[PDB]
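Hi both,

Apologies for the delay on this - the queue was longer than expected. I finally got the L0F-bound model through. Below you'll find the protein sequence and the ligand SMILES exactly as submitted, and right after that the structure tokens for the full complex including the ligand.
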Amino acid sequence: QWALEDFEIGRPLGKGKFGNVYLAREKQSKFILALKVLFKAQLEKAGVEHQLRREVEIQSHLRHPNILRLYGYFHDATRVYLILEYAPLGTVYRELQKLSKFDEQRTATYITELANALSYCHSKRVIHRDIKPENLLLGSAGELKIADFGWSVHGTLDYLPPEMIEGRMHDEKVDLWSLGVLCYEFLVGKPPFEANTYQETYKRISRVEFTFPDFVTEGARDLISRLLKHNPSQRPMLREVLEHPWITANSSK
Ligand SMILES: O=C(Nc1c[nH]nc1-c1nc2ccccc2[nH]1)c1ccccc1
């Protein structure tokens, strides 16, 4: 439906082994968006083609304010292009480096926003699995938008729950572990299972070994603790996460 000659590529926005994302503008529309340029060579070489059309599948059909729109896609001889909604305020990754930590009000807001985001996806039987700050963009509102459904289902272990890492029966409850991981990271500055090696992170995760800096308020600990349970079943429902008192007590939105 679209070709490259419909667009004007602007500033580079990012990297990621399979290519770069460039800001761009639709010629005849003046519309602003992010073009994610991916090569056919690299996608076949690193055996992924299958995952991509599943991203497009999922992300094309999804509709939520806290989920990065995928408007479409296309390709040529050399490469495949994904036409993505553009998120003015960049990644939450960046804002965490810049700010080192977030506060309880900013974290809970994001948590809420992310909760609702994830609440919608499970509804369509979809599991993200890869909720990490590098994957979380920001809109004009300053609002959280979950990008990238590369590893979505109907590398860095840091965000994966004990079940996935150990190679087991995994359900939509993985995303609550992630949310716990995310919540701690926002607050603390780094993930609760961070290690220097893959192998050590594996054990840290596999044995749910985390601890709280002193500044983490009591209710933060509580919500994280309930979310970071080795056994899926003990994990709150998204409802309960939204319902949690430290959330509501602090969750602006
Ligand atoms: O595709 C990536 N990011 C984006 C999709 N839509 N909008 C963006 C975006 N990136 C930004 C960077 C700075 C400021 C605003 C931005 N909006 C992407 C791909 C690979 C690595 C990182 C981001």
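Main takeaway for now: The beta strands are 7-14, 19-26, 32-39, 70-75, 79-84, 136-138, 144-146.

I'll put the files on the shared drive as well.

H.
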